[PDB]
Structure 1
């Protein structure tokens, strides 16, 4: 359960349903370098 509970917590820790796509994982306030390694490498870095 702890593995399942951890995934659900990360998807709801910010008070809204956060998808595990780029639209939810890159929107969270992480560093641009982490975001660029996931998806949208240049668009993420251009915005930063």
Structure 2
């Protein structure tokens, strides 16, 4: 339950739902090279 509740609260901690997609993780400003290390690289670096 520690890990499960930690996953769910890290999902919901931004005041709204966070589906594990580029379509969310690009919207959170959690590091341009985190975004680059995600599946899209050139667009997120190029926007940063």
- Map of 2:47 onto structure 1: 47
Whole-angstrom distance in 2 between the partners of 1:19 and 1:32 = 19
Whole-angstrom distance in 1 between the partners of 2:4 and 2:26 = 21
Q: CA deviation at 1:25?
A: 2.1
Specify every segment of 5 or more residues in structure 1 that has no aligned partner in the other structure, as ranges: none
Instruction: State the TM-score, normalized to the length of structure 2.
Output: 0.87
Aligned alpha-carbon RMSD (Å):
0.9
Larger fraction in helix: 1
Q: Which shows bigger deviation, 1-10 or 23-32?
A: 23-32
Specify every segment of 5 or more residues in structure 2 that has no aligned partner in the other structure, as ranges: none
How many residues matched?
48
